[PDB]
Amino acid sequence: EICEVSEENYIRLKPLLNTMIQSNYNRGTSAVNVVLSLKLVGIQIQTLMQKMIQQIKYNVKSRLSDVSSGELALIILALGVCRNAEENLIYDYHLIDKLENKFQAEIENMEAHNGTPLTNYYQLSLDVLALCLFNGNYSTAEVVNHFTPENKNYYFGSQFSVDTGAMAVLALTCVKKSLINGQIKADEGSLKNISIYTKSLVEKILSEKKENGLIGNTFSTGEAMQALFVSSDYYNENDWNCQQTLNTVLTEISQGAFSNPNAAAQVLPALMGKTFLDINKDSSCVSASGNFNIQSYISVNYSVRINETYFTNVTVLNGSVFLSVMEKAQKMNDTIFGFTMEERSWGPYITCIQGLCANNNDRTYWELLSGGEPLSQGAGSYVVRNGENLEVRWSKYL
Ligand SMILES: *[C@@H]1O[C@H](CO)[C@@H](O)[C@H](O)[C@H]1NC(C)=O
Ligand SMILES: *[C@@H]1O[C@H](CO)[C@@H](O)[C@H](O)[C@H]1NC(C)=O
Ligand SMILES: *[C@@H]1O[C@H](CO)[C@@H](O)[C@H](O)[C@H]1NC(C)=O
Numbered sequence: 526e527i528c529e530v531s532e533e534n535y536i537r538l539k540p541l542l543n544t545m546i547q548s549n550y551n552r553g554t555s556a557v558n559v560v561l562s563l564k565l566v567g568i569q570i571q572t573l574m575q576k577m578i579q580q581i582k583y584n585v586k587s588r589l590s591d592v593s594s595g596e597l598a599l600i601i602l603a604l605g606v607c608r609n610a611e612e613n614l615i616y617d618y619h620l621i622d623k624l625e626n627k628f629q630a631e632i633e634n635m636e637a638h639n640g641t642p643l644t645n646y647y648q649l650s651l652d653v654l655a656l657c658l659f660n661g662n663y664s665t666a667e668v669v670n671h672f673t674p675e676n677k678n679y680y681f682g683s684q685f686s687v688d689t690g691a692m693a694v695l696a697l698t699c700v701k702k703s704l705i706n707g708q709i710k711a712d713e714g715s716l717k718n719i720s721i722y723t724k725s726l727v728e729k730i731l732s733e734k735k736e737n738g739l740i741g742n743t744f745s746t747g748e749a750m751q752a753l754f755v756s757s758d759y760y761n762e763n764d765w766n767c768q769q770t771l772n773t774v775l776t777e778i779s780q781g782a783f784s785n786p787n788a789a790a791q792v793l794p795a796l797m798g799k800t801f802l803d804i805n806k807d808s809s810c811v812s813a814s815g816n817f818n819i820q821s822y823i824s825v826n827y828s829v830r831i832n833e834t835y836f837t838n839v840t841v842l843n844g845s846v847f848l849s850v851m852e853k854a855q856k857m858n859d860t861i862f863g864f865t866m867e868e869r870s871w872g873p874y875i876t877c878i879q880g881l882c883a884n885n886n887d888r889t890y891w892e893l894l895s896g897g898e899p900l901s902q903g904a905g906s907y908v909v910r911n912g913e914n915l916e917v918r919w920s921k922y923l
């Protein structure tokens with residue numbers, strides 16, 4: 526099933542539009558995914574598009590190897606949504622060949638280690654999808670090997686990463702199309718195995734559908750919708766009411782739930798009935814499209830768990846975010862609450878506390894909780910309230 530925002534309700538998407546526009550004044554965040562979504566729905570913003578190229582050119586010279594596989598995949602997608610002059614940058618800077626190397630690097634690490642890539646299956650899926658859409662050299666055999674639905678990298682503890690599964694589905698579907706078309710060769714029987722993978726992932730995705738229509742959570746719904754658009758083969762119209770989902774999302778938007786330019790960007794395409802598979806490197810650009818009118822305090826229970834728990838009383842200004850709490854709590858005692866952050870596009874990401882750094886290969890990270898409950902937002906975004914047990918917990922995957 527595919528449902529779209531009624532053109533009568535197109536105005537409801539205004540906050541996302543604005544939110545993504547304000548991204549301009551932020552060299553910290555990425556403009557790639559922002560421009561990616563916009564271009565994908567036939568909307569062009571010069572100011573953001575200019576910012577995108579700036580970052581892209583800045584990263585081809587230096588950082589070239591520091592850019593992650595998925596990040597490169599995203600760059601490739603944003604430049605090649607439709608055919609324009611900027612698409613040449615894909616074939617000028619050998620980005621596809623670069624992605625093949627970065628993707629292979631992910632593979633190497635999975636063998637050099639217990640099955641963990643340099644990043645994650647979400648990015649891995651992005652890689653395969655990009656390589657697939659742009660005729661890159663990838664092993665369809667290696668795809669079947671590493672993408673089985675029961676793979677550990679689809680799950681975080683007990684939670685099945687809806688985001689990951691959704692992106693996996695999109696990628697796998699692309700290969701599925703690239704196989705039916707003579708666009709690439711594959712060991713016969715692979716199509717079946719891929720379809721089966723896809724079938725399984727969809728059922729898992731739908732299993733995480735909330736009663737209000739959300740799939741996973743708010744910020745996984747956007748791309749879960751895309752995955753479900755392209756996989757009607759594996760579900761009935763009673764297993765999902767798309768219009769309900771669309772309604773719930775529209776409600777949250779009005780509630781400012783997508784103040785995060787990355788959260789906004791990732792939800793935009795599905796709301797307009799678009800998916801990443803709508804990307805055609807051989808032109809579809811609708812250029813003419815686009816036309817736009819224009820002293821309270823609070824206290825919380827700040828826990829930090831490793832084996833033992835170090836908890837304190839923190840009092841901050843109203844409207845303060847989780848990260849601010851962490852910063853004030855680190856002033857109270859640096860030995861116990863001193864931490865390390867990285868900007869990580871999405872916003873501040875907590876890497877180390879007390880010198881204990883998260884390790885990808887060790888499957889370990891710091892989890893953010895509110896009264897023993899995993900947050901749906903990053904530390905910089907999550908506005909804290911009152912009486913909350915704000916726990917930061919050393920965690921693994923099962
Ligand atoms: C498909 O899956 C079956 C069972 O897992 C396996 O025996 C076979 O090798 C796979 N076929 C291909 C072409 O990968
Ligand atoms: C555009 O928005 C402004 C906001 O002040 C409003 O005054 C005006 O009526 C709108 N015009 C059109 C054509 O939408
Ligand atoms: C604060 O958090 C810690 C860890 O969960 C807990 O031991 C303590 O009881 C909490 N205090 C309150 C006010 O609930």
Ligand SMILES: *[C@@H]1O[C@H](CO)[C@@H](O)[C@H](O)[C@H]1NC(C)=O
Pocket residue numbers: 831832919
């Ligand atoms: C906590 O305790 C475990 C086992 O008692 C120990 O191996 C580890 O170093 C400590 N911290 C963690 C969770 O790594």
Ligand SMILES: *[C@@H]1O[C@H](CO)[C@@H](O)[C@H](O)[C@H]1NC(C)=O
Pocket residue numbers: 824838839840
């Ligand atoms: C922490 O102290 C603040 C004021 O310093 C107080 O409002 C709060 O009640 C204290 N914590 C608890 C357990 O109430």
Ligand SMILES: *[C@@H]1O[C@H](CO)[C@@H](O)[C@H](O)[C@H]1NC(C)=O
Pocket residue numbers: 821822823843844911
């Ligand atoms: C601070 O403001 C928020 C919303 O503006 C409100 O929910 C909260 O009640 C205020 N502070 C307290 C302690 O109530």
Ligand SMILES: *[C@@H]1O[C@H](CO)[C@@H](O)[C@H](O)[C@H]1NC(C)=O
Pocket residue numbers: 858859860861
């Ligand atoms: C930090 O907290 C610990 C634990 O109570 C305390 O012993 C120490 O004096 C505090 N000061 C620092 C910065 O180490």
Ligand SMILES: [C-]#N
Pocket residue numbers: 681
């Ligand atoms: C993140 N899960």
Ligand SMILES: [C-]#N
Pocket residue numbers: 871874
């Ligand atoms: C998750 N970052």
